[PDB]
Assembly symmetry: D2
Homo-oligomer: 114 residues x 4
């Protein structure tokens, strides 16, 4: 299983944030440009298994971009945030990191889990 | 008064997020480059007056960057998030937009206020 | 001005939580009795001025009850929480305490403000 | 497994809220009495298995009380909230209900999960 996980929750409607596109990036330590690692689409439970392998999960700065505008558009409603990018520092690669997103049309929140 | 306002709250300590650098950008819709509009620092109450003028507040996509790593570093602690960017769409410029940040070392939240 | 303030934000719609009933209680330190101090109704800005006088703001355990179920029902929608009570300790009676509620139908959050 | 689950997260330190006392109550349909159903303590993952049996999970109003002040006191710190109660309505007894607590010394939040 992936050492990096997520969970998207639609807190306006009280259901998982299903079928949301998420793109995972890692900061290039040489040039400070962003490199794309992979993309995923959350399942029915708002989760996105297999984002990265233990082998590729090296220390660095990572970015998860949630396509929140597109998600809401597919539910027939507008979102204040066209997308959400969460940028976080990974230093100890043996810990598990859970990076969730609690979302409404006009709010969001996240926290570090394990 | 600026039609765009913020408020940074340190929810780990229950005090305002004072002396945090905030940078406001707007997307260039012809290119797709972000250009800096204003750089501010939050005051004792965690607020940042004068982010934009009414004249300069036009429809578009805006980004508020909060220098969360630098803020926490100055209090002698680390943050999971090196910075936080909140990206939002503005279509109606006759409304006030309040874009706060509630912050701990390991979580953050925002919402659209008036 | 009241040393205790609040602010209710409907984070599902990005608007103030107007016309919500809020009841303030203080714990009777001898019995297990909550005494009702004041009842209020949030204004168009989602606020409720005059919750308590400085003279009446003594050390103790306070409770603010927000009628969330009634609020949503008047909006024609259900809420997971029939009401919300926030219980808090006042020790230093010379500071300002702001005790807001950020609400959707399926979530809420609060924090200590000034 | 219990059809009601919880998860306490210490979002100040980015760790699970382990060893926190949790008491589950249900409102009496006839009297207005709250009755204790289960008392538990969170495990090292901040979770509390066995809150209720499937047979005992009937429609009604439930209340989860989290002993937040005692949690922080064991850690040598004060909390603004001496305890937190979340009151919620169970209408559909076939669903799973997850009722977490995201907590700092001066904030908390919850949402309805499944």
């Amino acid at each position: 299983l992936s050492p990096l996980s997520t969970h998207v929750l639609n807190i306006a409607q009280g259901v998982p944030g299903a079928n949301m596109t998420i793109v995972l990036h890692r900061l290039d330590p040489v040039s400070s440009a962003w490199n794309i690692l992979t993309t995923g689409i959350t399942n029915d439970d708002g989760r996105c298994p297999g984002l990265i392998t233990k082998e590729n999960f090296i220390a660095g700065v990572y970015k998860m971009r949630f396509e929140t505008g597109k998600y809401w558009d597919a539910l027939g409603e507008t979102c204040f945030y066209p997308y959400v990018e969460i940028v976080f520092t990974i230093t100890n690669t043996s810990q598990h990191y859970h990076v969730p997103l609690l979302l409404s049309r006009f709010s969001y929140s996240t926290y570090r889990g394990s």
